[PDB]
Design a protein around this nucleic acid. Sequence first.
RNA 1: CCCCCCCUCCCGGGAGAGCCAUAGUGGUCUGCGGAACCGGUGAGUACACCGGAAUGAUUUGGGCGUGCCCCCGCAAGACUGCUAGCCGAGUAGUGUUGGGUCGCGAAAGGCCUUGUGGUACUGCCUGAUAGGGUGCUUGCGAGUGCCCCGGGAGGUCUCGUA
RNA 2: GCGCAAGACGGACCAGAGCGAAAGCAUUUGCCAAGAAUGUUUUCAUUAAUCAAGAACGAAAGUCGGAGGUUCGAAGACGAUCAGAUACCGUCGUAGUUCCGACCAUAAACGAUGCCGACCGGCGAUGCGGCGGCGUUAUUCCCAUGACCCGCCGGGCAGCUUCCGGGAAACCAAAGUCUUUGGGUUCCGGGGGGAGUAUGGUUGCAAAGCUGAAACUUAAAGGAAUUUGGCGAAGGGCACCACC
Lengths: 149, 101, 129, 217, 83
Amino acid sequence: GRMHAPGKGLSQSALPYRRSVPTWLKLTSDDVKEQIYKLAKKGLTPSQIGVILRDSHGVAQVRFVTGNKILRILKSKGLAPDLPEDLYHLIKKAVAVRKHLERNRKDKDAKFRLILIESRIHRLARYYKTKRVLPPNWKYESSTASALV
Amino acid sequence: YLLRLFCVGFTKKRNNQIRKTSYAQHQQVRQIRKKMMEIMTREVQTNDLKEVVNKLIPDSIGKDIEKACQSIYPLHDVFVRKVKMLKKPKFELGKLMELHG
Amino acid sequence: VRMNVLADALKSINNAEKRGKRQVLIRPCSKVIVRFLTVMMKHGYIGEFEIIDDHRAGKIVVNLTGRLNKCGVISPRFDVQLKDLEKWQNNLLPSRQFGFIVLTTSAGIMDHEEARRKHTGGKILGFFF
Amino acid sequence: SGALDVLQMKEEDVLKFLAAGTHLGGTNLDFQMEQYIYKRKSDGIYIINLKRTWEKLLLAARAIVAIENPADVSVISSRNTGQRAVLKFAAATGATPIAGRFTPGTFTNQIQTAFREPRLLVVTDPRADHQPLTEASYVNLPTIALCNTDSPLRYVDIAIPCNNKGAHSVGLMWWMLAREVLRMRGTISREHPWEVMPDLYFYRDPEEIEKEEQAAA
Amino acid sequence: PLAKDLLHPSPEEEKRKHKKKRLVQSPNSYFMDVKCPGCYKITTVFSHAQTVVLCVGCSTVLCQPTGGKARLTEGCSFRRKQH
RNA sequence: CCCCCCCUCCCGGGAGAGCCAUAGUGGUCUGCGGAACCGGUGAGUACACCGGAAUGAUUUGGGCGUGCCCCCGCAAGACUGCUAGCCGAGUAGUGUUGGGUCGCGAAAGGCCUUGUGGUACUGCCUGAUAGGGUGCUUGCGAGUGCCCCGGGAGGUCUCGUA
RNA sequence: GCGCAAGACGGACCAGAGCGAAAGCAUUUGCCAAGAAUGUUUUCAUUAAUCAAGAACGAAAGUCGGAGGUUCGAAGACGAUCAGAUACCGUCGUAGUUCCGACCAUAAACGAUGCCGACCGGCGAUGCGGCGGCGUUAUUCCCAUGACCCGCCGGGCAGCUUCCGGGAAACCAAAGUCUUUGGGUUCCGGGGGGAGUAUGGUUGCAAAGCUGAAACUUAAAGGAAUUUGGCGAAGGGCACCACC
């Protein structure tokens, strides 16, 4: 079940058992690598990069045509941002919710959802600190809303 | 002449239908209401009182309503339930004589 | 969530035996499950049990012969000694002519009688009779 | 039943099945009759497989002729549709009929006058007639059922897929069962059929008895 | 059923069940290719697009994002590829 | 004269977008061969050219969706819309759900064999002999009855009346 | 019957229907923000479950400050009922009822049933999203679109039935998979009164909320269901010791 919702869901991707390169596709690794390079310097997040590749270029997954995933390629170049994308989106959502609650005073459920997303930010922050990708002096506050947008 | 036209509509149960519920979603009702308001405000703002009343003695506005709204969900019963007047222009006599002939 | 796949597997095969199905399904798989089912088939309570393999999570199909009564799991993971397993088999097993106690020793997953004749012991997995 | 060569279906039995309407089912579908329904046609009607019907008929006839006492098999009918069929079947084979208000004091109460415990029981339908099933549960007594796709199945050893809403279908199925059990017992030889009349077991509504009485001499 | 065999049933049985209840684990969606009637270049697109996609040469848009599979532009020839 | 009428029964003449069909009639599918394989060239769909390669000399029309799609010739079959002789013509006008090859739709004028056999009826009405609204009936429910013109006969069709 | 003015509320449409953590939510329109489920050959890769400290929200009633308070209506005032009513009944009636703030955190806040996860039968329905398949409806041919019908998939409120099984039985598809007793985990109770009482601490302007005894008495207090009761309970039949 979900970790804030009352209900339980079942909706996710499901890769097949067949771990092989598609025979009908004729693509190398260098052209798709510079396609990652171009679509990363255009200013997009890696989930949308995987979406746009499997939408337009007909690739099954990058792991079946290479030996590594997207973020490892981006850190090999160094164009991966210092903040993870899901944490960035959660911080942006929390900033938007707090900005809405600044002008809307009496809104109890929005405040409760603010508490829930702050709990999510805290849990991901402790995880990212204990897996040594962020320094321990990093800490999220309201005054950092314009710092890490 | 400023009027306030009211309208009402009930959905139609098909003869083939076995389900007894036959409701509609909120966006369907919203779009039906938008189409109904646009059609009802189009037929009044273009003509005077006598012409829209002569169009209102038969069911012409309603015939337009079940002509144009059956494409989204079939409905059968629309009458103009009430027309309320709010304000009138300056009082004269030629209009009063020309409505009588 | 699920944190003991062996207890769920044994409860599922117990429920399906009590209803009387012939072929059952277990959604997880592990080393402990497959060695436990081999010692099951070696002592003769089941038949030819299958396993599917994929790159995500294998499933186990187990044939049944109806020669089982109840098959439980000791939770949590207790430890026993050689002067201790008699106390367990007196108050846990239905008799001494049948009913086996499985346990993890240094030589692997194995039952209590050859552990007694080999004079070693360790943590206990479950039980069946 | 299907292991041998002569025991398969004949050519006119398919014609009798299609004439009597022994292929159409009800509206719903049960979860025990799933292996006899092949495919759902239009108008909400499910189709039984006739090979399965003939095969289970052979198995039930073998189970009937397995005993050596002909007066130890009992047939039960409750509704007014199939009444003459079980009576003339018991006249031909040697069975014992109970047609109309099966009394509950037969197999259990051992002091009553109507006390007869059989070896095999043949019910017309489990849903329309469920009282001998409950009393057959209380003694060592298997049951033979002519079940439809909407009839629930309980305490049934051998199930016959049937269309038990028409009297012609039930009568013709009883006719083929009697024909098979007399061929298996050794009275009528297999090389020549005795097919003189299937209308011995056919029931007609009370209009046709007066109509045929006025038509005949 | 008592002795229900879950080793190899009919493929309709795995067809009617869910994508994850299937004993051999495989999804239902697939890859496809489709062209424009007044063009030469043909490109491939997934069955569930989730973004609007246009054919190469910037001539005419091709698919539309839906909740289920992406609906195609009217008058376009296609066939399912498999390997 | 029972009548200003009106209604019913019997018998004919006209339109229709029902079935088996005729003349002008447009497409889809059902098999066979492009001598046989591997790449380059040019912006255009199925095109032209070469370079490899099989018997000094001669060659195979193409596509990139690897397997069926275009262009040919043969063999005839199953289905298909309009017109009433044809051009005019699917033409003005005609539609809101959205486009498409887009429904229904005459003409004026001109030109030729000079223009379909069997087969039912038609409560106004928006969209036909269809779909979708919707009657009269002994007061109650129902079998029959209900297009334009003409001729004869009759003037209270029936099944039970909470 | 026609106008003016104020306040409150959104019937019928409204269902064993939806949403939300719960308390709760129904005139249309415009703006902001959040979310379940569905689909996915997208991404991080163990980020997981429950929770002492601590924290948010929380029907009515209650107290402090205001504009304004229709109707209803504690305490109270006046008459009838009654042996006696300071009760039921009727007419007025203050604080309250509605809005903006400031507070206590109490209900039968009850599904009198903790959360997560696995398993064990069926039937026919409704709500969402997706999917396949006859035939109708938006000027008569195609396409997906809205609706109609037939089946499938996932989550949720469910309904019927079931010697699966459980229970003291009412009943439960969970209250099951339990002497054949062990999946993980938080709170919580040992005959009944005394008593949620006194003291102490705690919060509060205010009512009270949380924490929470002792002495003494007591052999019963309680839960399920059966048999005729006994009903100013319902529904039938009879009698001149009942009536017409």
